Design a protein around this ligand. Sequence first.
Ligand SMILES: CO[C@@]1(NC(=O)[C@@H](C)C(=O)O)C(=O)N2C(C(=O)O)=C(C)CO[C@@H]21
Ligand SMILES: CO[C@@]1(NC(=O)[C@@H](C)C(=O)O)C(=O)N2C(C(=O)O)=C(C)CO[C@@H]21
Ligand SMILES: CO[C@@]1(NC(=O)[C@@H](C)C(=O)O)C(=O)N2C(C(=O)O)=C(C)CO[C@@H]21
Ligand SMILES: CO[C@@]1(NC(=O)[C@@H](C)C(=O)O)C(=O)N2C(C(=O)O)=C(C)CO[C@@H]21
Ligand SMILES: [Zn+2]
Ligand SMILES: [Zn+2]
Ligand SMILES: [Zn+2]
Ligand SMILES: [Zn+2]
Ligand SMILES: [Zn+2]
Ligand SMILES: [Zn+2]
Ligand SMILES: [Zn+2]
Ligand SMILES: [Zn+2]
Lengths: 264, 264, 264, 264
Amino acid sequence: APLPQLRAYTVDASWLQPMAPLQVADHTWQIGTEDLTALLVQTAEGAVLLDGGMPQMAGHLLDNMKLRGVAPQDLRLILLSHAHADHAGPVAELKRRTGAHVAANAETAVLLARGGSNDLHFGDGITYPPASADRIIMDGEVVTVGGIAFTAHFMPGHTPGSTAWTWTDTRDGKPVRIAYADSLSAPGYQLKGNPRYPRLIEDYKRSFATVRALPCDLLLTPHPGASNWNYAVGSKASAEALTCNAYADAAEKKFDAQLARETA
Amino acid sequence: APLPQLRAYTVDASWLQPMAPLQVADHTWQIGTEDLTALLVQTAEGAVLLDGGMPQMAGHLLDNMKLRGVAPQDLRLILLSHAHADHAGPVAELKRRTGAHVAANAETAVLLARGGSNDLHFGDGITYPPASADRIIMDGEVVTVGGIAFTAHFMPGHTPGSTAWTWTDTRDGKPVRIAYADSLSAPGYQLKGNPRYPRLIEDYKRSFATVRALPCDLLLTPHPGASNWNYAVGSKASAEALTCNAYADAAEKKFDAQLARETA
Amino acid sequence: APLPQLRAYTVDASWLQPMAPLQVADHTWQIGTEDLTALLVQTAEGAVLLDGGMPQMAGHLLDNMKLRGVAPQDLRLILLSHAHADHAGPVAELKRRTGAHVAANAETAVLLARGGSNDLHFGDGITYPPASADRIIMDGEVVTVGGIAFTAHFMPGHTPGSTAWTWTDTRDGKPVRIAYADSLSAPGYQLKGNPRYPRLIEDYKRSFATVRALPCDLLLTPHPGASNWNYAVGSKASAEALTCNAYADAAEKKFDAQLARETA
Amino acid sequence: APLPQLRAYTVDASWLQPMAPLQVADHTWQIGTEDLTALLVQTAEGAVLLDGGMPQMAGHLLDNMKLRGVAPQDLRLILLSHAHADHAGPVAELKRRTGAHVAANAETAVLLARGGSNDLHFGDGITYPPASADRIIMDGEVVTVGGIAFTAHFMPGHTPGSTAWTWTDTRDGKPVRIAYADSLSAPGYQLKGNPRYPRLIEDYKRSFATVRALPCDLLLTPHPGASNWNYAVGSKASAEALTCNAYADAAEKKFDAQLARETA
Ligand SMILES: CO[C@@]1(NC(=O)[C@@H](C)C(=O)O)C(=O)N2C(C(=O)O)=C(C)CO[C@@H]21
Ligand SMILES: CO[C@@]1(NC(=O)[C@@H](C)C(=O)O)C(=O)N2C(C(=O)O)=C(C)CO[C@@H]21
Ligand SMILES: CO[C@@]1(NC(=O)[C@@H](C)C(=O)O)C(=O)N2C(C(=O)O)=C(C)CO[C@@H]21
Ligand SMILES: CO[C@@]1(NC(=O)[C@@H](C)C(=O)O)C(=O)N2C(C(=O)O)=C(C)CO[C@@H]21
Ligand SMILES: [Zn+2]
Ligand SMILES: [Zn+2]
Ligand SMILES: [Zn+2]
Ligand SMILES: [Zn+2]
Ligand SMILES: [Zn+2]
Ligand SMILES: [Zn+2]
Ligand SMILES: [Zn+2]
Ligand SMILES: [Zn+2]
């Protein structure tokens, strides 16, 4: 009766389906997969990448960046929603091959430094290669690259370092406020009385209100289905996309129902 | 045509077969599995653990330590042969649950800090939870716990930070010199002209001579089969065990044959 | 006209005046200096140290711990108020010589990992040897050592990771609720519109209310003068000590006056 | 009788005397001070900086890089001789302000990660802000930036991670082999029987032979006086410069004399 073997982190095949760069605004591009968002913001002084997806997506990301005329040495900054394997997986490999830096808050940095191990809910089940953060950012801090300002909005819940990023881009001259809001889900979490996260419910509640008040004309999420995006229908991907209010209100309804079922 | 899924690190079932603590000397015990060595040295001022095996062995290690009258808070120091998943796997979990410290050289420390990721030969294929080293030790440095001196002997090759540990114990009063020598294998390595390890062959050659000159009456290895140990036959486990000269000489014969076949 | 020389971190001589262990409760002791608090909590399963003072106090701390019958290997856990040189200075040296672990939140951990460098207000002016945290704790998390529960209460302001610790001890059988509240000062900080700390005022306001609602019968602070302690008059040190309400209310009056003067 | 105050790291005024960029080859420049070497190698795909000097030199380095038409975002890689405060001081500040990466061996990385604290000989007396290495390099490894190959040559002694860098540049078309060899001194070290460095003498001896066999037409050192450079007389700075053989032979004569005097 030997000990169990190690189990790999397996995801749906749609999370790993490569796609060509889909344009979101004049400078913003989706270069991830069909069910995983990886945003590229091209500026005059370099490129900014938000999230990266699964650890085995680093090659596909460099391929799409090459398609957009972005050399590896042109990636300046990597920003993250939260440091889980399905969103910050290839961060370590992308740092070695691009010369980019990583900016994240303290909670995302310490989780990223241990490769997502010792998770508050998942333990060591979802482990990815570790990476270090080069710049620690605070709530409301502005990160500027090539004349584009990225404002961080802390929204703890899914992870203690969950962060929504807001920036203003154009769409044929007309400005558009983009809000890349992190996930507001809690799959299988113990919500009430968690010894590892004593103030989990209070953080989620404050994060719901944080998402509602985000300056947003167009909303994106790490998982495109969370905001009703569909990267498969390229030009009509943002057809039935939710607002910031509709996204936070829908997430809280599932949170209260899950919280009430946990008490039973 | 989606990207490939992540693949888990799977080993032979004999590597994960738990075993009761097998005694090696008056203070040294084997508390790992049948095919993975994990040594416990009980002193008057605490316990010392050398290696830990696979990442899913932390519970079994604490079980055997409990059998030897060693509380979790009694583990003082964790020493390592080399920082691969099949030998330093549970180091991170053991640090959280025992209050122990880790002593290793700089090369083992940096590899352990990134959880074995970005390996010089294996890449990210063999990843385990990361852990940090608390004390950096040099070649020939002595680590003393409870009146027992542990001397480090650098033997780079399998990893840049491969280390053999020598200490003197007793066997019913009579002293015995124990040498825990690291692995001298190179499974599937590119030996000649490796860009990641330009001086690999020269390090192996110097390590062969380092193992031959080790003060040793009884030899152990991370994999017991490498030194002809058989943990299954408890009392007769050290029956046909190799000397330090026979172990290094046998490893070099396989190295030259592998090196010559690589040139063809 | 050469560049300026490096300037050392110099403090008042009263901050470095060694003192004998002054008892606070049945298990709590002050073993720091006259103007720097360093608390030792002796339990049945080991000792807990809160803060350490200046970096050159590690020897004095080990001397006082020896006076209390606490061996170096008996220090199990180091807790911190905030990671500045005058309170977490000797943490690195104490870890090497005691085999203890450090528990702190993510913000204190990342600041401690870079030795207090790149401070949000002080820059590199107050640098101390770096140390790594072994356990990351959340707001409201309980840390138990030897049957004594230490509850963390986040109170950001002086530093992003400022933490107040509450635990219940006895005084000749009768229980006493002790609250070790961090500093609520802001010496020379830019309060409004700080690019490195955009939500500084809002964090201070929430920290004032956090301190008022602390379960507390006896209050201590990293600097004893902040809570009207006087370690010099040993038995009557806690004579005119402030409550939690009086301490937070007095700190906010100075914060509003400083905030109003900054606007002028 | 209070504890002693912290003492700052003070150096000679000539170590902090700023100087204009002095040219060494077609792509190599000295942009440090008169008595501290900081080399800038301008390539078509970015700039490479070797060492930085004292921690308070980051501003002067960026000033000279601006004079050479090198923007902060054009610094790609920082290489180091050894990680002491007088040579890797501003590395942390330069990483925050340039977007560059650091490549160093494991021994230099772990020393740089703790800001030079816990030195094998100096203790905590020479502390500088900590920085992390992004790429770990081995002995003989080649680092290529903009078509220029930088080969690492390990020469342990002054520090365990001391490294000499060799690269080929031109001087009006004609190629020149440049060897930036680390310091071979040992000021006040205990050479024989050092518990922190048991194989110190053997490392120095092997480093002497490593320096003699360096491919070198022009030799530079972290301290220019060690190789008889004089940055003050700009055009004639390399007048009486030593060869690699003359530098290693002169260093070993002082090592044997110091070693013999230590035995007395
Ligand atoms: C770690 O990755 C996740 N979890 C899993 O894949 C497994 C472990 C699972 O929850 O069944 C995780 O969190 N995600 C999110 C999110 O919204 O962020 C959702 C909705 C679920 O998928 C990913
Ligand atoms: C990473 O673990 C090892 N490698 C593997 O498990 C796979 C990847 C394999 O080599 O086929 C590794 O190294 N070991 C040793 C050793 O002697 O250390 C030997 C002999 C082979 O097994 C383990
Ligand atoms: C970094 O140490 C401090 N600052 C200084 O020593 C200098 C830099 C200064 O502020 O003039 C700091 O913060 N302290 C506190 C506190 O309340 O924590 C107070 C009240 C002032 O003293 C220490
Ligand atoms: C830490 O910096 C050094 N040491 C000092 O400044 C003091 C502590 C001193 O040794 O008196 C150090 O090493 N250097 C070297 C070198 O060759 O690297 C030499 C020759 C001496 O100066 C610097
Ligand atoms: Zn997630
Ligand atoms: Zn997810
Ligand atoms: Zn191995
Ligand atoms: Zn192995
Ligand atoms: Zn402070
Ligand atoms: Zn203070
Ligand atoms: Zn030096
Ligand atoms: Zn020097």
